[model samples]
Target: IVEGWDAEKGIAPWQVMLFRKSPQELLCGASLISDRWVLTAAHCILYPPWDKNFTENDLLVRIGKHSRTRYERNVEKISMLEKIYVHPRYNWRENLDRDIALLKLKKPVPFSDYIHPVCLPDKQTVTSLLRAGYKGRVTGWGNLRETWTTNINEIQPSVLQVVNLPIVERPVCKASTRIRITDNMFCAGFKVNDTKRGDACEGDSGGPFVMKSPFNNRWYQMGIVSAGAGCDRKGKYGFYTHVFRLKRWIQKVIDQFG
Candidate 1:
């Protein structure tokens, strides 16, 4: 079992990237799928507003990063192939559930020592992994300390706290946020007031919830940070879209695009 991990063990070499809104603003986060594609929260696309259109010039994805503020190669031609693909039945008015998004780069990112893709979790094994006390690592260019606003120019990575299987029932989660937790979503967070260091805040949206596999010594994509009330508040929880749940859908989309 992976006990504890920091930037050295948790942050993969090739996973760093600078997500730029313009030449002046950039957001940082890790890559989950591969060099050609990236997984981030829909909120990133809906930042200014959900209805606004985001062109290729509006955003840029640069991988293979070390420092939160610096990038060796910043790609200016990158584009978000799809803007918003929330669950078809997702109800946004209810809350911020279904806040996930995917990016297809115009040019495939070349893999290198400082750049490599994490593995995706096997649907069948995800539940067991969680139940066994598997924890995930979340790194981002968000606030280092919990706050109301996000840090657009810096990258702050954290070893986020996680909860394994039988993920608190939907009914239980709904009672707290009045949002329905679908099968496609799995939660990883402590009850409110449990730990101050166990939550995602303002700028962590669209980031990854990752775990290292003991069987193969590989990192697997588990969840995408979606939404929650506050960072590790008592009685509050953060929701993530289960990568495994959407495995087939993702496969279909990729197959069609590739």
Candidate 2:
């Protein structure tokens, strides 16, 4: 959420925050795909390189939240995760390709004005949106600036932040950095000329990159914040998992488990 503005309340109902149990620290942002299913980046729940033994009990999911520091009873719903399902192909030691995971809630959430599920998009719809250069909104409670290197304790915003970033084609995105740009991933952020625009920073990982569908005017969760070259860099854009391409796996998990 580097250089982004506070998100309008109720606008991003599907957005949720993940926290570490013992330290009470915000780890990452996630999206509500269903009353019982949550989608996020695999790295959020996994240890560096590969640690499949990471305990799901150590994490907490907070929904319908706008402020990270402030606690509003009834407005916010905190739930324990029952299980974590990371994509088998995702390996942190290899690359960020296919960096997505699902969490099953111990109990289903009740829908409210500020709590709901984001619609999922098919591959064809996502392809058209990308080709059309549609701008998408990314919301999170991440750092307001990219200062993780200098100070890991840099002040972060308590309220949710929203930034609208346009899609960058694979070739164009690849030209800016040496990092691998696989088909399973996509880039979204402002180019060098767009100085006023912003990019998702630390704590934004696993957040939703959602676009409004022209057909139904409903927001569709298309991407998951996986990684970035750097926040608001000259040409390096933020990389996101292509959720549409992984829709089959997402549905399969929900069908079998939920």
Candidate 3:
């Protein structure tokens, strides 16, 4: 989340850190959607061009965390992953199509002031938000600057960062970049001529793009940080997995696997 400010405590209670191998290896971001389920991108698991043998045993999720390195034992909770349910249609070589994934935790997390679930949007909510061109907030501990080849940890922030971005119309988003923007995806960021901006980048993948509902004033997970042309570049917008478009698949997985 480049060009963004540090997130305040309790501002993103559902935001989660997805890690692999060790706590220092923060792979991607995720959101706690339920007591037993956390949502993230499938590429986070298969990334760095690894084999298909990666399993739940190698992944870890921590919630109620503000600092990546300094976590309070009584405030934050960490859990071993039990299962990973990647969308069947996700093709790693196809520019991250259907990139969403659901991870089941070995132990359910108990909700607290600093830990809770974000609401999922229904079809109508998704439609209304986009129709109004509403702004959404994306939070993560990703790189604070653009780094093409270096390890993300070299640039990733120690404290969680957040940015508010306006939703970009699909047609405009299509014209901005050469990358294929599928129907299952949406774009959000500053316009081509904006002078200031912050955007998702490596290590920010799989984080939540949430919008607050006008009627209820509750935050709803509207998208997942999937990809972008380049980090915070002019004329390039961050692409996200449209949550409503894949709601059925998400529900089915939770029902069958939960």
Worst 10 residues of 3 by lDDT: 227-236
Q: After superposition, how far is residue 162 of candidate 3 from its true place, in Å?
A: 0.7
Ranking by TM-score: 2, 3, 1
| Tens-digit lDDT track of model 3 for 1-258 | 878789998999999999776435788899999889999988887655665335798778899899977866788999789999989888787686798899999898988999999999987788778652568999998777767546666676788889888888889888877888899889988867888777887678889999999987889999999974336443478899988899999989988978
Error of 2 at 246 (Å): 0.3
**How far out, in Å, is residue 221 in model 2?**
0.6
- The deviation in Å at residue 209 for candidate 3 is 0.4
**Candidate 3 at residue 241, lDDT?**
91
Please, what are the lDDT tens digits per residue for candidate 1 over residues 72-166?
Answer: 35422233443324344445455455555666776676666656777887865686565423456655544444343466222244332222222
Which stretches in model 1 have alpha-carbon errors above 4 Å?
A: 1-6, 14-18, 28-30, 47-52, 73-97, 148-172, 191-196, 228-235
Return model 1's CA RMSD, one decimal.
Answer: 5.2
Candidate 3: which pairs clash?
A: none
Tell me the whole-model lDDT of each prediction, alpha carbons only.
0.55, 0.83, 0.84
TM-score of 2: 0.92
